[PDB]
Each structure stands twice: as structure tokens, then as C-alpha cells.
């Protein structure tokens, strides 16, 4: 991978490698998907919503396993969202209709569960969206509390930021994050029409984008992902498109329409990013995520 140029890779981006899922709720089916993440060995694991499962692949879309089930005990999830993987290779889940983050071992086993519904510290309206930083402290953004919260590895609450508005620093109802590897952490401002980009402290750091249908503008913004050298890709769902930006916040490129056949999307949802520049989608009105 040596000579590799990163920009030259991700501006030749339309064309999908392969896809997963399909409607059902076998495994290697999927319902109605909404937050992926990338694993330790650039694994695919998917919140496969509506089966309240979580379903992992290996890079090469070969399925691997599924853990949990209905329900609001233990391991179970009800409508799940969110997902993330830490550097210990533990499975971290926003359990929306549930309004709690549980955390599973390798094998999807349970570990431990936090949160309850409420507003107050470590409570959470409809959790929505999770991801770790290098350290392996959990970012929720709680979506109907507009702000994020921030937890250490075992559920102890330790700071949280966002409120609702329209303004510096302000969310409206924030679906998807990513921490980058310089601890800046990415906020898709879904209502806003923006990319929110804030410091560990919940200092506002910059601003992505603003609502418009041009290069370099969203209609709510859902997944969010950032590479290992600050490319911030964007699943801007209101206007059907993935977009993919620059370090410096600058667009790049753009790929993607309305549509159901290669490259076209219903119902974007969750994005990745693998470390070889594959982009990773979910298409949650289509059932299935792409890769490119």
C-alpha cells in the first residue's frame, strides 16, 4: 500500500465493489438497516434495526455472526442504531427504543448496560448513534436531547455538550458521530443541515457544510465517518449522495442518486470507513449496505 494517494483514491469513487443483505432476517439478511461500523481486521458490522440483531462480516462481505434479540433484557435490543467497535474489539450498541448503550464482549456476549431514559446526566431520550475514541471512551448522541454525551469504558458518565438550537454549538436532533484520531469529534447536525466538529471538551472546533442541494451542502446529514488522515465522508440523505471532504473541511467528491440498482440509495443511514479507503453505506430502504 505504500505509494498509495488517498485523494486519487477516494475522487475515482461511484462504482460499488460489492453488496450485503437483502430483505429478510436470515442471517446475512437485513430489515431496515441503520448504523455500520468498521472492525478491528476492517470487519463489516451492521445494526440490523428491525431484526434487533447486530450482524458481522468479515472485509470481504463473508458473514461471520449475529448476536441479540427482541426484547429489553440483557443482550437484547429493541430498535437498535447505533454501533461501534473499540480497540479491545468489544461491540458497543445504542439500544434506542430501550434509551441505553449496552456493551458486549468480541463473541456478543453481554457485559454491562447503562443509561435509562431522561434528560438528566447519563440519561438519554432516543440514543441513536455511538462510536469509541483511542482511549475507549463511549460518545452517544442522544437524538431527542440534542447534545452528546460523553461515558468512560464501563458506563461511568464523565462530561456531555450540545444543546438545542440552530447555533454555534447548538444540534438539532444529531443522528450519527465519529471521533477521529486527533480526538475531534464529528456530529452530523441532521436538522441543521451541517457537520458539527467539536473538541473532547465540547469546544466547537468547526462547521462542515449548510443546507443546499450544491457540492459541499446537506440535506439532513445522517452517517457520519473519518479516516485516519481526517477525509470526513458524509451520508447526505436528504439529497441521496455520499460526500467526501477533505482534511481541511473542503469538498472533495460527490457519488450517489435516488434508486435501488448499483449506486443509488433509498434511506441512507450509517457510514465507514475502512482503512484500505473503502467506503462503507447502509441503505436502509434498500435493505442492504454497499461498498466502494
Keep these: 500500500a505504500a505509494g498509495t494517494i488517498p485523494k486519487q483514491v477516494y475522487l475515482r469513487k461511484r462504482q460499488q465493489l460489492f453488496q450485503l443483505g437483502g430483505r429478510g432476517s436470515e442471517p446475512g439478511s437485513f430489515t431496515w438497516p441503520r448504523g455500520l461500523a468498521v472492525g478491528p481486521d476492517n470487519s463489516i458490522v451492521v445494526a440490523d434495526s428491525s431484526n434487533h440483531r ?26 437498535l442504531a447505533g454501533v ?31 443509561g435509562s431514559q431522561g434528560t438528566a446526566d447519563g440519561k438519554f431520550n432516543y440514543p441513536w448513534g455511538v462510536t469509541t475514541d483511542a482511549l475507549g471512551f463511549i460518545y452517544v448522541c442522544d437524538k431527542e436531547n ?3 454525551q460523553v461515558f468512560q469504558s464501563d458506563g461511568s458518565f464523565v462530561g456531555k455538550f450540545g444543546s438545542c438550537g440552530r447555533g454555534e454549538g447548538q444540534l438539532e436532533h444529531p443522528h450519527y458521530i465519529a471521533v477521529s484520531n486527533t480526538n475531534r469529534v464529528i456530529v452530523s447536525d441532521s436538522n441543521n443541515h451541517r457537520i458539527q466538529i467539536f473538541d473532547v471538551n465540547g469546544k466547537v472546533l468547526s462547521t462542515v457544510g449548510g443546507e443546499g442541494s450544491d457540492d459541499g451542502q446537506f440535506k439532513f446529514p445522517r452517517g457520519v465517518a473519518v479516516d485516519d488522515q481526517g477525509y470526513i465522508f458524509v451520508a447526505d440523505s436528504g439529497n441521496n449522495r455520499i460526500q467526501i471532504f477533505n482534511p481541511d473541511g473542503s469538498f472533495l467528491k460527490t457519488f450517489g442518486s435516488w ?21 462503507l453505506v447502509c441503505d436502509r430502504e434498500n435493505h442492504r449496505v454497499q461498498v466502494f
Design 54 to 79: 447486530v450482524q458481522v462480516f468479515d472485509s470481504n462481505g463473508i458473514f461471520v455472526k449475529e448476536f441479540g434479540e427482541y426484547g429489553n433484557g440483557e443482550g437484547e435490543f429493541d430498535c
Design 259 to 279: 434508486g435501488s440498482g448499483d449506486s443509488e440509495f433509498k434511506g441512507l443511514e450509517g457510514v465507514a470507513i475502512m482503512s484500505n479507503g473503502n467506503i
Design 84 to 114: 461501534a467497535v473499540n480497540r479491545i474489539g468489544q461491540y458497543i450498541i445504542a439500544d434506542r427504543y430501550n434509551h441505553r448503550i449496552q456493551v458486549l464482549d468480541p463473541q456478543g456476549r453481554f457485559l454491562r448496560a447503562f
Design 146 to 148: 440534542h447534545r452528546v
